[PDB]
């Protein structure tokens, strides 16, 4: 299964329905396409949904719901994810694993083009996947549009013609930004499983999750904080795994939630501030869902750890 | 400039092709207009109600019917969810029931895209800076009987289209599609209150979403009006993403918007309407508003939340403990 | 409306997208099609959704929602159903009313082929429906794939050529099993209406419901238990009915939930174990949704009976 060929099905919908989605498609002088989903345009709920689905290599279903009840409790529009290709979609494609630095353009790149450039190499080793395709689709969290030199750099790294590169872009501080980041709820768990817990994510057979769409804050530092908090305080995840002899799934579940990290307990913006706006001072294990539920198909066991913390989410977003 | 009639026609064509699957009935009038019965002599269906509602929004919103996942003892009902990235155009340019249709003994409020050709009422279109241009007109009608040839001819003439290119969708208040389409007005009730009562410029609403329960169907048209209003006024949640300008007081828009800000809030609408001697004039029109309102001001990053979903009044309205 | 012809629309998507859905399509030498949705394959969320839609004869919408609000409350991925053909979809097709026993293959058969073989006959009389079709589509809750003899038995019972038989199969203990059993939340109430309450289910005009996907347990008895429990402690239903003079809809509503049954209150596995693993000692009225909501369109009345029991769901699932 090819993440670039599969994601191209959704890129084609985005391009055909650009006007309906409040996004803007441009062609660079070299033939690459840029799809502005939030820099100079508003984007839309559906554009955010489709952008997230392209980050996932087309190997997940993405929806926007309003979960929550007939009661006084706080509820928000939320992004739900379902995937039956959990390592490939979330780590082979969605993870923002490519540092894109060209002139004054700096952004983390996500999406299926990462599975042609193999960014980073160790992820593709561990999930035993690589793509083969003649087009490359990357999504970029950035406050400006990339130009011709960024497209050429991505083309060369992916081994494709630059006229076959497609770049989707939206700032952190946009609706599409809030949606795509909430849509990383499942990814934050599989990456913590792989990098921090040393759990083999090829064992995760199915996965789903949901996290709220953070309010959009025009300050990019504040938007980083509120969008991370959406996942960390508001996210729920469900992983269906096939354990093997010697695995300790109860420990994986207990270790996974954001609350197991050191420095947990404050809105991200405040954590990052306490840390001197420096990542060396931050436990990256904090980047994880609020709540983790794991069904081990090998034993029939169900584990539930963490919980959604509505008080900390409301603190983050500025409401009582 | 997007056309609400041409966009809604994509959904009308699915309703026509799938009419038997949807439990609705399409007829052709002798003057060539099309009538789509979604509840007068037919049962309609969940999907008919979804699609009816999408047509009322001009095709410029997504509409779903959710069955809530809530593993607790709390009361929960099937609900209508709305998402729109054209908020004033979809909800006010199309959805709002701004046309009083009175022809012989047929009387109903007309909603949907045809309003944006007949400009009903004029001030809405001036304030949202939108008018359609189309050679067909689609109107939905909350009525207990099917409209005939003269009603279609009147709508065609007011819309400046040929009557053969008129499409009328009809469902009683007291029907499944009536409860769905009125729950689907959850976002509209806030945008119209912003425009008409709070004098807020709704062209500043960039995105909007909302959800409201589907009221139980009561065969008494006056009781059905009360229960379906109550679904929004007590059960509706709304989410408005706005771009404020200097001098706006978004905190005050948020606080002023919910149904509970109105005088007379606090009883089922049937009882409010009766205590008021069944006359719309004795009613605070600010009462027609969502239960809960959340506003994200994109200009500042602020989040505001006002009002609340009132389960006790939904249960009282619907007759359950 | 033909439940076989309508379900074939979904079968065709399952066939075309088999690799994308982690299911396996095979053809037997006699030309029948077997679609393995969980025996030797993982299946998927979308396979389970489409399997459940095929069980309902294509006459319902099925979704998988990822509920999970902003609170400490337990929430699980759940299956939602909406239907405007409630007796035909849930009893004429979905109900697992056909005992399939051929050699050492034993399973209950669900889906549209039941409306050709008329299994059982009384259901088709009471709902006033029968199909007419030249293909037959059956779903089977089984731990092994059926072979040519099972396909030929189905073909002959349904009056079709075996080359036009389609069998979908998944074990109880699989993702598709958990999904398709949670998808029976509305059927559990319509069957109990017809069989236990003697209520005429042709009066149900619309219906919807939702139940959680149970955790998958590889023990088939424990899987039977946990997937039952998803509906009987976790399921909500909504029936829109048209009562007539003489009907007592308040009594229907009160008598329908799982909690009105004898032996209610323990996870099903434990109920069943106490019963000596014998369906004779079990009140089958316990196979009902946890919560029942009825709107009587003739009167405008709303009734709500039963309730979701999150503590017993948690007990059943071991958390």
PDB file of N, CA and C in Angstrom, chain A residues 67-69 73-76 80-85 205-210 212 234 236 238 240 295-300 302-304 307-308 310 313, chain C residues 19-22 42-46 49 63-77 175 213-218 226 314 317-319:
ATOM      1  N   UNK A  67     -18.914  15.871  20.395  1.00  0.00           N
ATOM      2  CA  UNK A  67     -19.239  14.787  21.319  1.00  0.00           C
ATOM      3  C   UNK A  67     -19.745  15.386  22.618  1.00  0.00           C
ATOM      4  N   UNK A  68     -20.133  14.637  23.617  1.00  0.00           N
ATOM      5  CA  UNK A  68     -20.627  15.409  24.762  1.00  0.00           C
ATOM      6  C   UNK A  68     -22.134  15.495  24.820  1.00  0.00           C
ATOM      7  N   UNK A  69     -22.633  16.020  25.916  1.00  0.00           N
ATOM      8  CA  UNK A  69     -23.915  15.565  26.323  1.00  0.00           C
ATOM      9  C   UNK A  69     -25.031  16.634  26.527  1.00  0.00           C
ATOM     10  N   UNK A  73     -21.881  20.310  31.131  1.00  0.00           N
ATOM     11  CA  UNK A  73     -20.414  20.145  30.949  1.00  0.00           C
ATOM     12  C   UNK A  73     -19.943  20.793  29.655  1.00  0.00           C
ATOM     13  N   UNK A  74     -18.749  21.352  29.656  1.00  0.00           N
ATOM     14  CA  UNK A  74     -18.073  21.952  28.499  1.00  0.00           C
ATOM     15  C   UNK A  74     -17.867  20.875  27.409  1.00  0.00           C
ATOM     16  N   UNK A  75     -18.164  21.259  26.195  1.00  0.00           N
ATOM     17  CA  UNK A  75     -18.048  20.412  24.988  1.00  0.00           C
ATOM     18  C   UNK A  75     -17.546  21.259  23.878  1.00  0.00           C
ATOM     19  N   UNK A  76     -16.731  20.702  22.989  1.00  0.00           N
ATOM     20  CA  UNK A  76     -16.248  21.369  21.755  1.00  0.00           C
ATOM     21  C   UNK A  76     -16.306  20.525  20.516  1.00  0.00           C
ATOM     22  N   UNK A  80     -12.045  13.152  15.249  1.00  0.00           N
ATOM     23  CA  UNK A  80     -11.944  11.733  15.523  1.00  0.00           C
ATOM     24  C   UNK A  80     -11.157  11.044  14.422  1.00  0.00           C
ATOM     25  N   UNK A  81     -10.389  10.049  14.847  1.00  0.00           N
ATOM     26  CA  UNK A  81      -9.518   9.296  13.960  1.00  0.00           C
ATOM     27  C   UNK A  81      -9.838   7.779  14.194  1.00  0.00           C
ATOM     28  N   UNK A  82      -9.845   7.080  13.054  1.00  0.00           N
ATOM     29  CA  UNK A  82      -9.892   5.620  13.076  1.00  0.00           C
ATOM     30  C   UNK A  82      -8.859   5.131  12.076  1.00  0.00           C
ATOM     31  N   UNK A  83      -8.054   4.150  12.461  1.00  0.00           N
ATOM     32  CA  UNK A  83      -7.066   3.615  11.518  1.00  0.00           C
ATOM     33  C   UNK A  83      -6.881   2.121  11.707  1.00  0.00           C
ATOM     34  N   UNK A  84      -6.741   1.398  10.614  1.00  0.00           N
ATOM     35  CA  UNK A  84      -6.410  -0.045  10.670  1.00  0.00           C
ATOM     36  C   UNK A  84      -5.015  -0.294  10.106  1.00  0.00           C
ATOM     37  N   UNK A  85      -4.285   0.816  10.008  1.00  0.00           N
ATOM     38  CA  UNK A  85      -2.867   0.749   9.600  1.00  0.00           C
ATOM     39  C   UNK A  85      -2.063   1.615  10.587  1.00  0.00           C
ATOM     40  N   UNK A 205      -2.752  -3.183  16.053  1.00  0.00           N
ATOM     41  CA  UNK A 205      -3.508  -3.682  14.899  1.00  0.00           C
ATOM     42  C   UNK A 205      -4.606  -2.659  14.471  1.00  0.00           C
ATOM     43  N   UNK A 206      -5.215  -1.973  15.440  1.00  0.00           N
ATOM     44  CA  UNK A 206      -6.244  -0.970  15.140  1.00  0.00           C
ATOM     45  C   UNK A 206      -6.027   0.178  16.117  1.00  0.00           C
ATOM     46  N   UNK A 207      -6.416   1.393  15.746  1.00  0.00           N
ATOM     47  CA  UNK A 207      -6.335   2.469  16.748  1.00  0.00           C
ATOM     48  C   UNK A 207      -7.371   3.543  16.428  1.00  0.00           C
ATOM     49  N   UNK A 208      -7.902   4.224  17.434  1.00  0.00           N
ATOM     50  CA  UNK A 208      -8.790   5.324  17.210  1.00  0.00           C
ATOM     51  C   UNK A 208      -8.566   6.320  18.300  1.00  0.00           C
ATOM     52  N   UNK A 209      -9.054   7.541  18.115  1.00  0.00           N
ATOM     53  CA  UNK A 209      -8.901   8.596  19.159  1.00  0.00           C
ATOM     54  C   UNK A 209      -9.760   9.801  18.856  1.00  0.00           C
ATOM     55  N   UNK A 210      -9.897  10.649  19.847  1.00  0.00           N
ATOM     56  CA  UNK A 210     -10.653  11.874  19.606  1.00  0.00           C
ATOM     57  C   UNK A 210     -10.023  12.962  20.453  1.00  0.00           C
ATOM     58  N   UNK A 212     -10.388  17.550  21.182  1.00  0.00           N
ATOM     59  CA  UNK A 212     -11.081  18.779  20.802  1.00  0.00           C
ATOM     60  C   UNK A 212     -10.318  19.711  19.902  1.00  0.00           C
ATOM     61  N   UNK A 234      -7.140  16.910  26.630  1.00  0.00           N
ATOM     62  CA  UNK A 234      -8.472  16.560  26.060  1.00  0.00           C
ATOM     63  C   UNK A 234      -8.523  15.296  25.256  1.00  0.00           C
ATOM     64  N   UNK A 236      -8.556  11.395  23.956  1.00  0.00           N
ATOM     65  CA  UNK A 236      -8.771   9.994  24.282  1.00  0.00           C
ATOM     66  C   UNK A 236      -8.256   9.094  23.163  1.00  0.00           C
ATOM     67  N   UNK A 238      -7.631   4.812  21.811  1.00  0.00           N
ATOM     68  CA  UNK A 238      -8.015   3.410  21.925  1.00  0.00           C
ATOM     69  C   UNK A 238      -7.087   2.596  21.006  1.00  0.00           C
ATOM     70  N   UNK A 240      -5.688  -1.280  19.931  1.00  0.00           N
ATOM     71  CA  UNK A 240      -6.023  -2.733  19.944  1.00  0.00           C
ATOM     72  C   UNK A 240      -4.717  -3.374  19.544  1.00  0.00           C
ATOM     73  N   UNK A 295      -6.804  -2.490  24.433  1.00  0.00           N
ATOM     74  CA  UNK A 295      -7.341  -3.869  24.453  1.00  0.00           C
ATOM     75  C   UNK A 295      -6.245  -4.748  23.892  1.00  0.00           C
ATOM     76  N   UNK A 296      -5.820  -5.750  24.689  1.00  0.00           N
ATOM     77  CA  UNK A 296      -4.867  -6.710  24.201  1.00  0.00           C
ATOM     78  C   UNK A 296      -5.572  -7.904  23.628  1.00  0.00           C
ATOM     79  N   UNK A 297      -5.560  -8.049  22.312  1.00  0.00           N
ATOM     80  CA  UNK A 297      -6.279  -9.132  21.702  1.00  0.00           C
ATOM     81  C   UNK A 297      -5.721 -10.476  22.052  1.00  0.00           C
ATOM     82  N   UNK A 298      -4.456 -10.516  22.479  1.00  0.00           N
ATOM     83  CA  UNK A 298      -3.854 -11.807  22.811  1.00  0.00           C
ATOM     84  C   UNK A 298      -4.478 -12.390  24.091  1.00  0.00           C
ATOM     85  N   UNK A 299      -4.854 -11.559  25.077  1.00  0.00           N
ATOM     86  CA  UNK A 299      -5.350 -12.000  26.373  1.00  0.00           C
ATOM     87  C   UNK A 299      -6.819 -11.637  26.608  1.00  0.00           C
ATOM     88  N   UNK A 300      -7.374 -10.679  25.816  1.00  0.00           N
ATOM     89  CA  UNK A 300      -8.728 -10.186  26.110  1.00  0.00           C
ATOM     90  C   UNK A 300      -8.752  -9.112  27.143  1.00  0.00           C
ATOM     91  N   UNK A 302      -8.512  -5.496  28.997  1.00  0.00           N
ATOM     92  CA  UNK A 302      -8.775  -4.074  28.729  1.00  0.00           C
ATOM     93  C   UNK A 302      -8.092  -3.281  29.838  1.00  0.00           C
ATOM     94  N   UNK A 303      -7.330  -2.224  29.434  1.00  0.00           N
ATOM     95  CA  UNK A 303      -6.658  -1.326  30.352  1.00  0.00           C
ATOM     96  C   UNK A 303      -7.098   0.087  30.069  1.00  0.00           C
ATOM     97  N   UNK A 304      -7.293   0.870  31.112  1.00  0.00           N
ATOM     98  CA  UNK A 304      -7.638   2.263  30.974  1.00  0.00           C
ATOM     99  C   UNK A 304      -6.799   3.068  31.917  1.00  0.00           C
ATOM    100  N   UNK A 307      -6.855  10.124  32.148  1.00  0.00           N
ATOM    101  CA  UNK A 307      -8.231  10.672  32.043  1.00  0.00           C
ATOM    102  C   UNK A 307      -8.164  12.020  31.442  1.00  0.00           C
ATOM    103  N   UNK A 308      -9.252  12.438  30.799  1.00  0.00           N
ATOM    104  CA  UNK A 308      -9.351  13.777  30.288  1.00  0.00           C
ATOM    105  C   UNK A 308      -9.521  14.721  31.451  1.00  0.00           C
ATOM    106  N   UNK A 310     -10.755  18.142  32.276  1.00  0.00           N
ATOM    107  CA  UNK A 310     -11.482  19.292  31.808  1.00  0.00           C
ATOM    108  C   UNK A 310     -11.042  20.588  32.508  1.00  0.00           C
ATOM    109  N   UNK A 313      -7.910  21.747  30.715  1.00  0.00           N
ATOM    110  CA  UNK A 313      -8.263  22.237  29.385  1.00  0.00           C
ATOM    111  C   UNK A 313      -8.913  23.640  29.423  1.00  0.00           C
TER     112      UNK A 313
ATOM    113  N   UNK C  19      -8.586  -5.422   0.103  1.00  0.00           N
ATOM    114  CA  UNK C  19      -7.271  -5.216   0.673  1.00  0.00           C
ATOM    115  C   UNK C  19      -7.231  -3.990   1.607  1.00  0.00           C
ATOM    116  N   UNK C  20      -7.930  -2.918   1.232  1.00  0.00           N
ATOM    117  CA  UNK C  20      -7.983  -1.749   2.069  1.00  0.00           C
ATOM    118  C   UNK C  20      -8.700  -1.984   3.430  1.00  0.00           C
ATOM    119  N   UNK C  21      -9.598  -2.990   3.485  1.00  0.00           N
ATOM    120  CA  UNK C  21     -10.399  -3.323   4.662  1.00  0.00           C
ATOM    121  C   UNK C  21      -9.815  -4.473   5.460  1.00  0.00           C
ATOM    122  N   UNK C  22      -8.657  -5.021   5.072  1.00  0.00           N
ATOM    123  CA  UNK C  22      -8.043  -6.155   5.742  1.00  0.00           C
ATOM    124  C   UNK C  22      -9.001  -7.358   5.823  1.00  0.00           C
ATOM    125  N   UNK C  42      -7.387  -9.590   9.913  1.00  0.00           N
ATOM    126  CA  UNK C  42      -7.666  -8.734  11.056  1.00  0.00           C
ATOM    127  C   UNK C  42      -9.026  -8.044  10.975  1.00  0.00           C
ATOM    128  N   UNK C  43      -9.521  -7.889   9.743  1.00  0.00           N
ATOM    129  CA  UNK C  43     -10.649  -6.998   9.484  1.00  0.00           C
ATOM    130  C   UNK C  43     -10.279  -5.607   9.910  1.00  0.00           C
ATOM    131  N   UNK C  44     -11.284  -4.752  10.070  1.00  0.00           N
ATOM    132  CA  UNK C  44     -11.074  -3.328  10.282  1.00  0.00           C
ATOM    133  C   UNK C  44     -12.362  -2.647  10.789  1.00  0.00           C
ATOM    134  N   UNK C  45     -12.276  -1.414  11.189  1.00  0.00           N
ATOM    135  CA  UNK C  45     -13.488  -0.703  11.577  1.00  0.00           C
ATOM    136  C   UNK C  45     -14.459  -0.640  10.429  1.00  0.00           C
ATOM    137  N   UNK C  46     -13.997  -0.265   9.251  1.00  0.00           N
ATOM    138  CA  UNK C  46     -14.902  -0.123   8.125  1.00  0.00           C
ATOM    139  C   UNK C  46     -15.402  -1.476   7.678  1.00  0.00           C
ATOM    140  N   UNK C  49     -18.320  -2.118   9.984  1.00  0.00           N
ATOM    141  CA  UNK C  49     -19.434  -1.279   9.661  1.00  0.00           C
ATOM    142  C   UNK C  49     -20.179  -1.847   8.445  1.00  0.00           C
ATOM    143  N   UNK C  63     -22.641   3.445  11.425  1.00  0.00           N
ATOM    144  CA  UNK C  63     -21.445   4.270  11.634  1.00  0.00           C
ATOM    145  C   UNK C  63     -20.698   3.765  12.859  1.00  0.00           C
ATOM    146  N   UNK C  64     -19.418   4.076  12.858  1.00  0.00           N
ATOM    147  CA  UNK C  64     -18.605   3.893  14.037  1.00  0.00           C
ATOM    148  C   UNK C  64     -18.164   5.234  14.592  1.00  0.00           C
ATOM    149  N   UNK C  65     -18.691   5.578  15.744  1.00  0.00           N
ATOM    150  CA  UNK C  65     -18.371   6.828  16.332  1.00  0.00           C
ATOM    151  C   UNK C  65     -17.329   6.647  17.378  1.00  0.00           C
ATOM    152  N   UNK C  66     -16.548   7.680  17.524  1.00  0.00           N
ATOM    153  CA  UNK C  66     -15.574   7.693  18.547  1.00  0.00           C
ATOM    154  C   UNK C  66     -16.075   8.760  19.463  1.00  0.00           C
ATOM    155  N   UNK C  67     -16.837   8.282  20.444  1.00  0.00           N
ATOM    156  CA  UNK C  67     -17.406   9.098  21.472  1.00  0.00           C
ATOM    157  C   UNK C  67     -16.269   9.379  22.412  1.00  0.00           C
ATOM    158  N   UNK C  68     -16.490  10.234  23.369  1.00  0.00           N
ATOM    159  CA  UNK C  68     -15.440  10.555  24.315  1.00  0.00           C
ATOM    160  C   UNK C  68     -15.442  12.031  24.621  1.00  0.00           C
ATOM    161  N   UNK C  69     -16.301  12.418  25.552  1.00  0.00           N
ATOM    162  CA  UNK C  69     -16.460  13.782  25.882  1.00  0.00           C
ATOM    163  C   UNK C  69     -15.432  14.253  26.864  1.00  0.00           C
ATOM    164  N   UNK C  70     -15.571  15.479  27.308  1.00  0.00           N
ATOM    165  CA  UNK C  70     -14.526  16.082  28.101  1.00  0.00           C
ATOM    166  C   UNK C  70     -14.723  15.892  29.616  1.00  0.00           C
ATOM    167  N   UNK C  71     -14.603  14.644  30.035  1.00  0.00           N
ATOM    168  CA  UNK C  71     -14.851  14.334  31.435  1.00  0.00           C
ATOM    169  C   UNK C  71     -14.176  13.044  31.735  1.00  0.00           C
ATOM    170  N   UNK C  72     -14.167  12.676  32.996  1.00  0.00           N
ATOM    171  CA  UNK C  72     -13.575  11.435  33.395  1.00  0.00           C
ATOM    172  C   UNK C  72     -14.435  10.218  33.061  1.00  0.00           C
ATOM    173  N   UNK C  73     -15.607  10.436  32.517  1.00  0.00           N
ATOM    174  CA  UNK C  73     -16.505   9.297  32.251  1.00  0.00           C
ATOM    175  C   UNK C  73     -15.874   8.277  31.302  1.00  0.00           C
ATOM    176  N   UNK C  74     -16.066   6.958  31.581  1.00  0.00           N
ATOM    177  CA  UNK C  74     -15.733   5.925  30.582  1.00  0.00           C
ATOM    178  C   UNK C  74     -16.442   6.142  29.201  1.00  0.00           C
ATOM    179  N   UNK C  75     -15.715   5.977  28.100  1.00  0.00           N
ATOM    180  CA  UNK C  75     -16.218   6.104  26.711  1.00  0.00           C
ATOM    181  C   UNK C  75     -15.474   5.070  25.874  1.00  0.00           C
ATOM    182  N   UNK C  76     -16.165   4.521  24.891  1.00  0.00           N
ATOM    183  CA  UNK C  76     -15.577   3.547  23.979  1.00  0.00           C
ATOM    184  C   UNK C  76     -16.033   3.857  22.537  1.00  0.00           C
ATOM    185  N   UNK C  77     -15.224   3.472  21.536  1.00  0.00           N
ATOM    186  CA  UNK C  77     -15.730   3.392  20.148  1.00  0.00           C
ATOM    187  C   UNK C  77     -17.036   2.625  20.133  1.00  0.00           C
ATOM    188  N   UNK C 175     -12.572  -8.014  15.901  1.00  0.00           N
ATOM    189  CA  UNK C 175     -13.083  -6.657  15.803  1.00  0.00           C
ATOM    190  C   UNK C 175     -14.421  -6.668  15.064  1.00  0.00           C
ATOM    191  N   UNK C 213     -18.381  -0.873  21.195  1.00  0.00           N
ATOM    192  CA  UNK C 213     -17.624  -2.024  20.702  1.00  0.00           C
ATOM    193  C   UNK C 213     -16.921  -2.688  21.921  1.00  0.00           C
ATOM    194  N   UNK C 214     -17.275  -3.940  22.221  1.00  0.00           N
ATOM    195  CA  UNK C 214     -16.662  -4.657  23.379  1.00  0.00           C
ATOM    196  C   UNK C 214     -15.208  -4.951  23.041  1.00  0.00           C
ATOM    197  N   UNK C 215     -14.389  -4.957  24.089  1.00  0.00           N
ATOM    198  CA  UNK C 215     -13.006  -5.448  23.954  1.00  0.00           C
ATOM    199  C   UNK C 215     -13.021  -6.873  23.453  1.00  0.00           C
ATOM    200  N   UNK C 216     -12.076  -7.162  22.587  1.00  0.00           N
ATOM    201  CA  UNK C 216     -11.969  -8.505  21.997  1.00  0.00           C
ATOM    202  C   UNK C 216     -11.317  -9.498  22.904  1.00  0.00           C
ATOM    203  N   UNK C 217     -12.013 -10.613  23.260  1.00  0.00           N
ATOM    204  CA  UNK C 217     -11.399 -11.621  24.137  1.00  0.00           C
ATOM    205  C   UNK C 217     -11.255 -12.892  23.311  1.00  0.00           C
ATOM    206  N   UNK C 218     -10.068 -13.519  23.223  1.00  0.00           N
ATOM    207  CA  UNK C 218      -9.842 -14.691  22.326  1.00  0.00           C
ATOM    208  C   UNK C 218     -10.593 -15.953  22.790  1.00  0.00           C
ATOM    209  N   UNK C 226     -18.879 -10.697  26.685  1.00  0.00           N
ATOM    210  CA  UNK C 226     -18.525  -9.255  26.658  1.00  0.00           C
ATOM    211  C   UNK C 226     -19.302  -8.575  25.550  1.00  0.00           C
ATOM    212  N   UNK C 314     -18.138  -1.866  32.982  1.00  0.00           N
ATOM    213  CA  UNK C 314     -16.736  -1.917  33.453  1.00  0.00           C
ATOM    214  C   UNK C 314     -16.424  -3.255  34.125  1.00  0.00           C
ATOM    215  N   UNK C 317     -15.935  -5.851  31.480  1.00  0.00           N
ATOM    216  CA  UNK C 317     -14.758  -5.709  30.676  1.00  0.00           C
ATOM    217  C   UNK C 317     -13.483  -5.776  31.533  1.00  0.00           C
ATOM    218  N   UNK C 318     -13.626  -5.870  32.848  1.00  0.00           N
ATOM    219  CA  UNK C 318     -12.492  -6.084  33.770  1.00  0.00           C
ATOM    220  C   UNK C 318     -11.779  -4.788  34.124  1.00  0.00           C
ATOM    221  N   UNK C 319     -12.458  -3.623  34.152  1.00  0.00           N
ATOM    222  CA  UNK C 319     -11.803  -2.366  34.552  1.00  0.00           C
ATOM    223  C   UNK C 319     -12.550  -1.654  35.669  1.00  0.00           C
TER     224      UNK C 319
END
